[PDB]
Nucleic acid binder design. Structure first.
Ligand SMILES: [Mg+2]
Ligand SMILES: [Mg+2]
Ligand SMILES: [Mg+2]
Ligand SMILES: [Zn+2]
Lengths: 33, 209, 83, 67, 129, 100, 220, 72, 113
RNA sequence: AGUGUGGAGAUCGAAGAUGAUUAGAGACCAUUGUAGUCCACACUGCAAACGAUGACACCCAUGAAUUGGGGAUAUCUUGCACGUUUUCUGUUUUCACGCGAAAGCUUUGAGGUUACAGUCUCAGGGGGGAGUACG
């Protein structure tokens, strides 16, 4: 009720998804190196 | 006003004129004070009311009569009053001077095809607040306004203001007596030395019931 | 007064009025501007044929300062006494 | 599409409208198909009753001025 | 803090003229401000003015006659050669028939018409019309 | 679009940083003290009918000694104030009217 | 025929007022469109339609459509007027805008760029007019320049009698309702700018309604 | 309150413009080399090639057609 | 037996203006007068008009009724300072300090109150 | 909010457990409960960290109210409080001129700008990809 039309999905949850992705990539690179 | 191109004292306030003003307490107002009328205030009396400077009140009145004079066809001046205490004080005034009177319908001065469409040349009102519609309409058609204003009167679209109490029945009918008398004296129907024959009881208003 | 061609004639039509208080031009669409005539009075207290005319621009009236402007104009003109 | 043009008075509803209104209709043959035209006219009154009705309108009252 | 005394004074005069005032008080004053006002006075755009002494930077009371439309300063004070007068006239003046650009030159503070007649350049201070 | 000049609270720009929150009377939601709707309530302990029966049986409570009352200060969240009819939405032009 | 209602309309019917400049002098409103065509010859007042477009209003089960028209009048000699009206059909809107344009006539001041030879050909000073986001700025130009403007403002300037001018538009000029009014406002501003040529005072005049007040009473 | 104005402030104004020109998408494309490498043409107006096969590409909605193309 | 329509109310007012001296508080005599002075098609409408006319007559007996203006009895009802000079104005002190500041000084017959 | 090392552990309570709702209910509701919530020392440097409004300086319409200090001249207790009028600083409320696409702003600017220049400084240049990839 307090916000316009976001697009996609609640931006905070989108950011949380990107955060988890970056953590997984960091782990894979660490294993390879 | 009182000052004349030729040095004279005829248009000056005498003792008799002043006496009536204190008789009906036309010099007193209400407790609130507008910022546009500070120049007409003298001081605060008991209970918080304000005193109006009688000298400037006289000068405004005589200036108003001088403007009313030199206007041909007195019907060009309309006198309006939305207050109920001046409903007859305007008629007795108009019955003696010959001006138009009425005591409002939006569009009277603006709706050309209206049946009651009139365009007076000078408007006279009794209270700028209660006659806001009248004076607001006059602003679109280049009509000057002369008003009887108190200590808390908004002076918008008002050109000549007479500082006086327009709340009491006595004061409202008392003021129109001077205005009626002065124009007749200026016109020449009567002479200054003789007392004015008309008395204020006809101007004084009473309960219709 | 006005614009001259340097050929000798005026090319400026309708030199407009100027407000007495502020000395500003009054435009053709200024429907709040007014003109007031004040009667002259002879020594006996009877009016005279001549009259005094002044003009006030619409902006002053809407602001609510026309009454103050009129007072100072008449004091300077000597129409009324200051004291 | 349908278009309408009007001017003046026009009474509907009730029964008196059949007496005070004159109506007609026709079909007109363009190259594309049929066209309908209707015309209705509100007749003014008349004392004779030839160019209009005799009776006044059902809801009009007139007060005769005293001598 | 206040950086330009001349710009402060000219802004004060322009506002009072726009509001229809008859007198305006200017504070603080300086030699440059007084010379600018005298150029305006010579061309009839203001009336008389009075300088008051207070053992500090003084004050000025100016009488207005309603003929001023706008006055303002130019900052920074760009250099103007004798061939740049036309460019400045077309950029900040309402027309070529009235209005002045005020300069400071080796011969003193003057308007652009006087400066051109004497064949001198300088730095632009302000304008009025 | 800013709906209210005061933003629905009583905290102008250069006045305060933070105001301590309080619990709503009904639901318990935490809300700043200057934003909550506040009322003072002085209600009779007994209804008019039941008071008469108790007063009749009481040697103490007659006509020259009234019965005690309850005094409470109530603060509600916005949602609980609206549903409980304490405060209702007003037209755009009437939102400025403030009583005391 | 024409039966005047206002006092000004009766005066021009009686030929007591003959020039449009007297009306402009006292800043009086024109409420009958027959006044301006009486005081201007029928062979010199040119009118033209500028734009017509539909506006709509949503409604349960459909929508409602109307038309708006813009008209401009002038004699190409320092007089210009613009009017706009809305009607249920294009014919009705066009007729009503012609009346409104005549009632909005204002005078235009003209001057010289540099040397003063012959008739005035350009505006006397820079002016800008604003309506909505659209602003139009007019700059005096030399004798051979012509009208340098977009097709919509150029047409209006031709009807006013300006030969040479430089123009510049500011923002969202495709909104032609605002563009037309912005050009009109800039021209109307030419007679309000005090110049050194208008410094001296003039003798006061008397209102036409005051001069013929006695006759005005007789007519009614 | 958006730009510096001093008489001896040319260095600040020069640096400010240089950094803000990069925000222009058109200006940046013409002053970098990434676009030229991406362009199958090496910056030329035309190129020659060999046809590999003929394909059909469906038109995007709301149109409906099979647009005839080749791969080169 | 419900609200009176504006066509009935406007007609009843017109009748009272022109025929006031012929009417009274009786429905049955008033109806006879109306059937002579009005031309109308509906008998039912004439009954409603005679009903509301009788209502207006009763109200006019008590006092004036807005929207009538009989204009024959109003005129008759319309046609139907020395007291305070003796008493004395007795203005307050703040006014007293201002009366003598004038060029005419303190006016005669004044007090302090 | 989170992390480390020592304390503390009443209340509330991420994770988890058990009842109910429900087609499903891992949720909203009920009873609980670990980390936490609190303290000391050491990290982290993010918020609708908002007046979504950078800092300093000038001019500006009216009436209120209110906090602190000062100047001048009725009420009450027995030095205090209060009354009237001025003043400096702060902090607010009644479409000022004017501005703006509007909503709205208005001595407290979002005013004094195409009639465009008081001083310094930070950021932006259609929507995404993306605050992502590499360093
Ligand atoms: Mg905060
Ligand atoms: Mg549940
Ligand atoms: Mg628990
Ligand atoms: Zn709640």
């Amino acid at each position: 009720g307090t916000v316009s039309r976001p697009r996609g999905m609640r931006p905070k949850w989108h950011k949380k998804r990107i955060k988890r992705l970056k953590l997984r990539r960091r782990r894979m690179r660490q294993r390879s190196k | 006003m009182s000052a004349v191109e030729s040095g004279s004292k005829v248009l000056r306030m005498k003792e008799s004129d002043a006496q009536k003003l204190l008789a009906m307490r036309c010099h007193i107002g209400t407790r609130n004070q507008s910022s546009a009328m500070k120049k007409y205030i003298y001081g605060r009396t008991a209970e918080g009311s304000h005193i109006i400077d009688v000298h400037m009140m006289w000068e405004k009145l005589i200036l108003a009569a001088r403007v009313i004079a030199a206007v041909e066809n007195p019907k060009d001046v309309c006198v309006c009053s939305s207050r109920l205490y001046g409903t007859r004080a305007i008629y007795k005034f108009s019955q003696h001077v010959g001006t138009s009177f009425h005591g409002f319908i939006p569009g009277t001065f603006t709706n050309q095809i209206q049946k009651k469409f009139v365009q007076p040349r000078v408007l006279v009102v009794t209270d700028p607040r209660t006659d806001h519609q009248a004076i607001r309409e006059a602003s679109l058609v280049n009509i000057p306004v002369i008003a009887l204003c108190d200590t808390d009167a908004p002076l918008e679209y008002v050109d000549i203001a007479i500082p006086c109490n327009n709340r009491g029945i006595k004061s409202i009918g008392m003021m129109y007596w001077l205005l009626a008398r002065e124009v007749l004296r200026l016109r020449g129907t009567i002479v200054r030395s003789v007392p004015w024959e008309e008395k204020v009881d006809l101007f004084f208003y009473r309960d219709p019931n | 007064i006005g614009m001259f061609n340097e050929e000798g004639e005026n090319v400026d039509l309708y030199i407009p009025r100027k407000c007495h208080a502020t000395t500003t031009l009054i435009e053709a669409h200024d429907h709040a501007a007014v003109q007031i005539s004040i009667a002259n009075v002879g020594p006996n207290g009877v009016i005279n044929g001549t009259t005094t005319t002044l003009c006030i621009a619409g902006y002053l009236r809407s602001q609510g300062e026309s009454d103050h402007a009129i007072n100072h104009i008449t004091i300077d003109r000597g129409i009324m006494r200051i004291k | 599409k349908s278009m309408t043009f009007r001017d003046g008075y026009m009474i509907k509803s009730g029964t008196a409208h059949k007496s005070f209104v004159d109506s007609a209709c026709r079909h007109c043959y363009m190259r594309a198909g049929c066209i309908g035209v209707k015309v209705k006219i509100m007749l003014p009154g008349d004392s004779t009753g030839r160019n209009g009705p005799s009776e006044p309108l059902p809801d009009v009252i007139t007060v005769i001025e005293p001598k | 803090t206040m950086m330009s005394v001349l710009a402060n004074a000219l802004r004060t005069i322009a506002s009072a003229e726009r509001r229809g005032k008859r007198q305006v008080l200017i504070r603080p004053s300086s030699k440059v401000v007084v010379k600018f006002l005298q150029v305006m006075q010579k061309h009839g755009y203001i009336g008389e003015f009075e300088i008051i002494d207070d053992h500090r930077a003084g004050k000025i009371v100016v009488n207005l006659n309603g003929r001023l439309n706008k006055c303002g300063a130019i900052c920074p004070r760009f250099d103007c050669a004798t061939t740049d007068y036309e460019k400045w006239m077309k950029n900040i003046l309402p027309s070529r028939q009235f209005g002045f650009v005020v300069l400071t030159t080796s011969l003193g503070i003057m308007d652009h018409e006087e400066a051109r007649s004497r064949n001198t350049g300088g730095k632009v201070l302000g304008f009025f019309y | 679009t800013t709906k209210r000049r005061n933003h629905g609270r009583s905290k102008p720009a250069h006045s305060r940083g933070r105001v301590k929150p309080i619990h709503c009377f009904n639901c318990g939601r935490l809300t700043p003290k200057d934003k909550a709707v506040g009322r003072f309530v002085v209600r009779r302990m007994l209804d008019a009918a039941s008071a008469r029966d108790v007063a009749e049986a009481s040697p103490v409570y007659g006509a020259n000694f009234p019965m005690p009352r309850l005094y409470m200060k109530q603060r509600f969240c916005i949602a609980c104030a609206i549903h409980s009819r304490t405060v209702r939405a007003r037209p755009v032009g009437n939102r400025k009217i403030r009583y005391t | 025929e024409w039966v005047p209602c206002t006092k000004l309309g009766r005066l021009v019917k009686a030929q007591k007022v003959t020039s449009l400049e007297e009306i402009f002098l006292f800043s009086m409103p024109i409420k009958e469109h027959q006044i301006v065509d009486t005081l201007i010859a029928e062979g010199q007042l040119h009118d033209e339609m500028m734009k017509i477009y539909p506006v709509q209003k949503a409604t349960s089960a459909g929508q409602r459509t109307r038309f708006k028209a813009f008209n401009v009048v002038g004699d190409c000699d320092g007089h210009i007027g613009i009017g706009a009206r809305v009607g249920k059909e294009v014919s009705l809107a066009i007729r009503a805008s012609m009346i409104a344009a005549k009632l909005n006539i204002v005078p235009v001041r003209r001057g010289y760029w540099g040397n003063k030879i012959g008739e005035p050909h350009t505006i006397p000073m820079k002016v800008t007019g604003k309506c909505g986001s659209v602003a139009v700025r007019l700059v005096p130009a030399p004798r051979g320049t012509g009208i340098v403007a977009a097709p919509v403002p150029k047409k209006i300037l031709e009807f006013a009698g300006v030969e040479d001018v430089y123009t510049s538009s500011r923002g969202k000029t495709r909104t032609h309702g605002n563009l037309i009014m912005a050009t009109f406002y800039a021209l109307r501003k030419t007679y309000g700018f005090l110049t050194p040529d208008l410094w001296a005072d003039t003798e006061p005049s008397r209102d036409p309604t005051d001069e013929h007040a006695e006759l005005l009473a007789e007519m009614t | 309150m958006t730009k510096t104005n001093g008489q001896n402030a040319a260095r600040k104004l020069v640096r400010l413009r240089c950094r803000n020109r990069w925000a222009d998408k058109g200006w940046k494309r013409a002053h970098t080399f990434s676009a030229r490498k991406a362009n199958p043409f090496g910056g030329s107006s035309h190129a020659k090639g060999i046809v590999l096969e003929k394909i059909g590409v469906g038109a995007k909605q709301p149109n409906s057609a099979i647009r005839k193309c080749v791969r080169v | 037996g419900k609200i009176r329509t504006k066509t009935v109310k406007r007609a009843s007012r017109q009748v009272v203006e022109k025929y006031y001296s012929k009417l009274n508080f009786d429905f049955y005599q008033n109806k006879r007068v109306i059937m002579d002075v009005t031309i109308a098609e509906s008998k039912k409408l004439k009954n409603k008009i005679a009903g509301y006319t009788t209502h207006i007559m009763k109200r006019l007996a008590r006092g004036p009724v807005r929207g009538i203006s009989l204009k024959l009895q109003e005129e008759e009802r319309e046609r139907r300072v020395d007291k305070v000079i003796q008493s004395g104005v007795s203005v307050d002190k703040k006014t007293m300090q201002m009366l003598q500041r004038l060029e005419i000084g303190v006016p005669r017959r004044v007090k302090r109150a």
